[PDB]
C-alpha cells in the first residue's frame, strides 16, 4: 500500500515522518483515523492522514 | 465519501480561473470549508472533491486548500 | 495568423499540452476542438485551454 504526499511535511518532532509533495510513502499503520505510520527516505514515523492520497486510485 | 484525504479551504474560489477547457464543473470554495477529495495527484493543479460545507462536487485549484488537521 | 492573450497562468497537466503565464501572447494554430486549441508560445506548440485566453 502506497500513498502519495499531496503536500510537504517537515516536522520538528521525533517520531514523525518527513516528506515532500509528490513523494510516495509506504503505509505501515493506518489504524488510527488521523495519524498514520509510514516509510519514506530511509525512515519511518507518524504523519497526519490528510497529507496523503491513495496511489491505487 | 470513502477513505480519502480531507482538506480545509483557506482561500475562496468562485470559478475563476475556470477548470482548464471546462473538463469538469467547478467547485465553489469558501474559507473554512472541509473538502473530501475524490480525485487528486500531487503533480496536478486541479483536484476533484466534495465540499462537505455545501454538499457540492467539482474541480478546484489545489492552491486554495491545505490538509484538514 | 491569429493571436490570443492569456488571462491566467496554465501549467500543462498532460503531455502535448502548452503552458503559459497570464499576459503571454499565443499564436493560434488550430481551433478545431471546442475547448482545446493548438497554439504556439515560448518556442513550443501544444494544446491550450481556450477558456484561458482572449482574442487580440
Amino acid at each position: 500500500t502506497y500513498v502519495q504526499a499531496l503536500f510537504d511535511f517537515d516536522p520538528q518532532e521525533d517520531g514523525e515522518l518527513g516528506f515532500r509533495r509528490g513523494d510516495f510513502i509506504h503505509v505501515m499503520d493506518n489504524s488510527d483515523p488521523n495519524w498514520w505510520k509510514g516509510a519514506c527516505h530511509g525512515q519511518t514515523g507518524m504523519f497526519p492522514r490528510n497529507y496523503v492520497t491513495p496511489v491505487n486510485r | 465519501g470513502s477513505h480519502m484525504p480531507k482538506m480545509e479551504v483557506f482561500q475562496e474560489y468562485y470559478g475563476i480561473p475556470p477548470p482548464p477547457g471546462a473538463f469538469g464543473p467547478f467547485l465553489r470554495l469558501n474559507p473554512g470549508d472541509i473538502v473530501e477529495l475524490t480525485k487528486a495527484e500531487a503533480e496536478h493543479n486541479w483536484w476533484e472533491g466534495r465540499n462537505t460545507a455545501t454538499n457540492e462536487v467539482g474541480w478546484f485549484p489545489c492552491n486554495r486548500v491545505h490538509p484538514y488537521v
Side-chain angles (χ1 to χ4, degrees), chain B residues 10 16 20 25 29 39-40 52 55:
Chain B
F10 66 77
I16 297 296
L29 305 177
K39 291 175 180 60
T52 67
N55 192 227

mmCIF file of all heavy atoms in Angstrom, chain B residues 10 16 20 25 29 39-40 52 55:
data_model
loop_
_atom_site.group_PDB
_atom_site.id
_atom_site.type_symbol
_atom_site.label_atom_id
_atom_site.label_comp_id
_atom_site.label_asym_id
_atom_site.label_seq_id
_atom_site.Cartn_x
_atom_site.Cartn_y
_atom_site.Cartn_z
ATOM 1 N N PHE B 10 -8.573 27.506 2.606
ATOM 2 C CA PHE B 10 -8.094 28.721 3.266
ATOM 3 C C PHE B 10 -8.289 29.953 2.386
ATOM 4 O O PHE B 10 -8.225 31.083 2.863
ATOM 5 C CB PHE B 10 -6.648 28.582 3.779
ATOM 6 C CG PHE B 10 -5.619 28.420 2.698
ATOM 7 C CD1 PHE B 10 -5.197 29.523 1.943
ATOM 8 C CD2 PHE B 10 -5.080 27.164 2.421
ATOM 9 C CE1 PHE B 10 -4.254 29.363 0.922
ATOM 10 C CE2 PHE B 10 -4.142 27.001 1.411
ATOM 11 C CZ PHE B 10 -3.730 28.098 0.661
ATOM 12 N N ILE B 16 -13.054 31.202 -10.914
ATOM 13 C CA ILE B 16 -12.116 31.993 -11.705
ATOM 14 C C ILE B 16 -10.744 31.798 -11.058
ATOM 15 O O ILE B 16 -10.577 32.052 -9.875
ATOM 16 C CB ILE B 16 -12.485 33.507 -11.692
ATOM 17 C CG1 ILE B 16 -13.851 33.752 -12.339
ATOM 18 C CG2 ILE B 16 -11.420 34.324 -12.431
ATOM 19 C CD1 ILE B 16 -13.906 33.395 -13.801
ATOM 20 N N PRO B 20 -9.465 24.174 -16.611
ATOM 21 C CA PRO B 20 -8.950 24.229 -17.990
ATOM 22 C C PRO B 20 -9.801 23.478 -19.003
ATOM 23 O O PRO B 20 -10.070 22.296 -18.833
ATOM 24 C CB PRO B 20 -7.570 23.582 -17.872
ATOM 25 C CG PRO B 20 -7.141 23.928 -16.485
ATOM 26 C CD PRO B 20 -8.418 23.715 -15.682
ATOM 27 N N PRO B 25 -17.065 20.455 -13.942
ATOM 28 C CA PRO B 25 -17.688 21.591 -13.247
ATOM 29 C C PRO B 25 -16.818 22.113 -12.095
ATOM 30 O O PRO B 25 -16.170 21.324 -11.411
ATOM 31 C CB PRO B 25 -18.995 20.992 -12.722
ATOM 32 C CG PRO B 25 -18.592 19.597 -12.375
ATOM 33 C CD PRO B 25 -17.704 19.182 -13.562
ATOM 34 N N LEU B 29 -15.649 27.244 -3.351
ATOM 35 C CA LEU B 29 -14.987 27.054 -2.064
ATOM 36 C C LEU B 29 -15.028 28.338 -1.244
ATOM 37 O O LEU B 29 -14.804 29.423 -1.776
ATOM 38 C CB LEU B 29 -13.511 26.667 -2.268
ATOM 39 C CG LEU B 29 -13.109 25.459 -3.122
ATOM 40 C CD1 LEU B 29 -11.571 25.410 -3.185
ATOM 41 C CD2 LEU B 29 -13.660 24.170 -2.544
ATOM 42 N N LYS B 39 -10.592 12.906 -6.322
ATOM 43 C CA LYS B 39 -9.547 12.696 -7.329
ATOM 44 C C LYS B 39 -8.442 13.702 -7.042
ATOM 45 O O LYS B 39 -8.698 14.895 -7.030
ATOM 46 C CB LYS B 39 -10.085 12.964 -8.737
ATOM 47 C CG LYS B 39 -11.112 11.907 -9.210
ATOM 48 C CD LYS B 39 -11.720 12.257 -10.572
ATOM 49 C CE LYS B 39 -12.715 11.181 -10.992
ATOM 50 N NZ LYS B 39 -13.822 11.059 -10.003
ATOM 51 N N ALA B 40 -7.229 13.226 -6.798
ATOM 52 C CA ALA B 40 -6.108 14.137 -6.564
ATOM 53 C C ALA B 40 -4.765 13.478 -6.889
ATOM 54 O O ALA B 40 -4.584 12.302 -6.629
ATOM 55 C CB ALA B 40 -6.114 14.638 -5.110
ATOM 56 N N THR B 52 -17.932 19.362 1.754
ATOM 57 C CA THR B 52 -18.897 18.948 2.771
ATOM 58 C C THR B 52 -19.628 20.112 3.468
ATOM 59 O O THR B 52 -20.589 19.884 4.219
ATOM 60 C CB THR B 52 -18.292 17.948 3.797
ATOM 61 O OG1 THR B 52 -17.291 18.586 4.601
ATOM 62 C CG2 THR B 52 -17.668 16.764 3.084
ATOM 63 N N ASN B 55 -22.135 20.394 0.286
ATOM 64 C CA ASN B 55 -22.511 19.119 -0.341
ATOM 65 C C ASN B 55 -22.499 19.198 -1.886
ATOM 66 O O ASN B 55 -23.297 18.543 -2.568
ATOM 67 C CB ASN B 55 -23.862 18.589 0.178
ATOM 68 C CG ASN B 55 -24.116 17.144 -0.230
ATOM 69 O OD1 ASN B 55 -25.206 16.797 -0.702
ATOM 70 N ND2 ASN B 55 -23.123 16.299 -0.048
#
